[PDB]
Design a protein around this ligand. Structure first.
Ligand SMILES: NCCN1CCOCC1
Length: 330
């Protein structure tokens, strides 16, 4: 089998992408943030504290004839950005772009932190990292991809995010019309539960490529590109007026600038992120300063190839027994 669903930016800056997901019988469609950096499929629900719901579509398991309460199972997650959520677990039929998984764990939120409440466009998350990071306790649950894996024509999923435009998540197949050149695959370490790989280096604009190993994760659930301070400083040094701001929380630059591209290595292949993708957006509407799409990973503990980087490529998350990651230009 296969599935194909369109993913859409939630706002004019691509702060996050939402993909419609069908849950239950009859279908209840919720717009979830597909996150390759986490492994819980959780939704705003009929159990969520009313004061913490502000415009989101909720999942009501009592209205689903296929919903089954997973007795004694609870979940509680805290993300790298400081946001959190928790609640109970049901199993239900979940479909993404025509691909159906029966008995998928759907984590019904009872509580969500304020960061979630204020994003009316995000009805929950659909985790696509390895199932070893799933928070369901005591019985750890599998991700939608992990459950679908055996039934798919090929055990893979692809991310094709658009810049200020819709994109696609495909399951079980590779669309050979969606990219230029070829897909270069690279090794993945599953030791930390992430799609963790090693980039072979970088270039700033038309500069000479520097061969240097950069371990990081392909994370569709992170908005920006987070790289070592050395790399990030060499990039922003090419932009007049760029500087790190403590009030904004990172590199800002004058909105008047046209930015250089940033290239990252995938084996002997090169993915070029256009300068416009790195011009993330104004720190406020009408502001003099704009927030950088490339930021330092110094306080995080891991480098993150977030949406700024992934939207420049067709990305294959290969879930075979020994997982690999593929990148193609587009
Ligand atoms: N609620 C703050 C976080 N979110 C994250 C996704 O984009 C919008 C802002």
């Amino acid at each position: 089998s296969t599935g194909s669903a369109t993913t859409t930016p939630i706002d004019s800056l691509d702060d996050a992408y939402i993909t419609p997901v069908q849950i239950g019988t009859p279908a209840q469609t919720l717009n979830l943030d597909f996150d390759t950096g986490s492994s819980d499929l959780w939704v705003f629900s009929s159990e969520t504290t009313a004061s913490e719901v502000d415009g989101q579509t909720i999942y009501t398991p009592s209205k689903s004839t296929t919903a089954k309460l997973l007795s004694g199972a609870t979940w509680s997650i805290s993300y790298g950005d400081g946001s959190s959520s928790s609640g109970d677990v049901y199993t239900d039929t979940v479909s993404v772009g025509g691909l159906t998984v029966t008995g998928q764990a759907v984590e019904s939120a009872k509580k969500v932190s304020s960061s979630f409440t204020e994003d009316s466009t995000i009805d929950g998350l659909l985790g696509l990292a390895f199932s070893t990071l799933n928070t369901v306790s005591p019985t750890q649950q599998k991700t939608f991809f992990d459950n679908a894996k055996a039934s798919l024509d090929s055990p893979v999923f692809t991310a094709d995010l658009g810049y200020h435009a819709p994109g696609t998540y495909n399951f079980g197949f590779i669309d050979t019309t969606a990219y230029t050149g070829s897909i270069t695959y690279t090794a993945v370490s599953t030791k930390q539960g992430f799609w963790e790989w090693t980039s072979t280096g970088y270039a700033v604009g038309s500069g000479t490529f520097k061969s240097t190993s950069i371990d990081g994760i392909a994370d569709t659930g992170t908005t920006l590109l987070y790289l070592p301070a050395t790399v990030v400083s060499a990039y922003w040094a090419q932009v007049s007026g760029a500087k790190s701001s403590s009030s904004v929380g990172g590199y800002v630059f004058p909105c008047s600038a046209t930015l250089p591209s940033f290239t990252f290595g995938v084996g002997s292949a090169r993915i070029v992120i256009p300068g416009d993708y790195i011009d993330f957006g104004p720190i406020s509407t009408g502001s003099s300063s704009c927030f950088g799409g490339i930021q330092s990973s110094a306080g995080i503990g891991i480098n993150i190839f977030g949406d700024v980087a992934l939207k420049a490529a067709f990305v294959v998350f290969n879930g075979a027994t020994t997982p690999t990651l593929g990148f193609a230009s587009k």
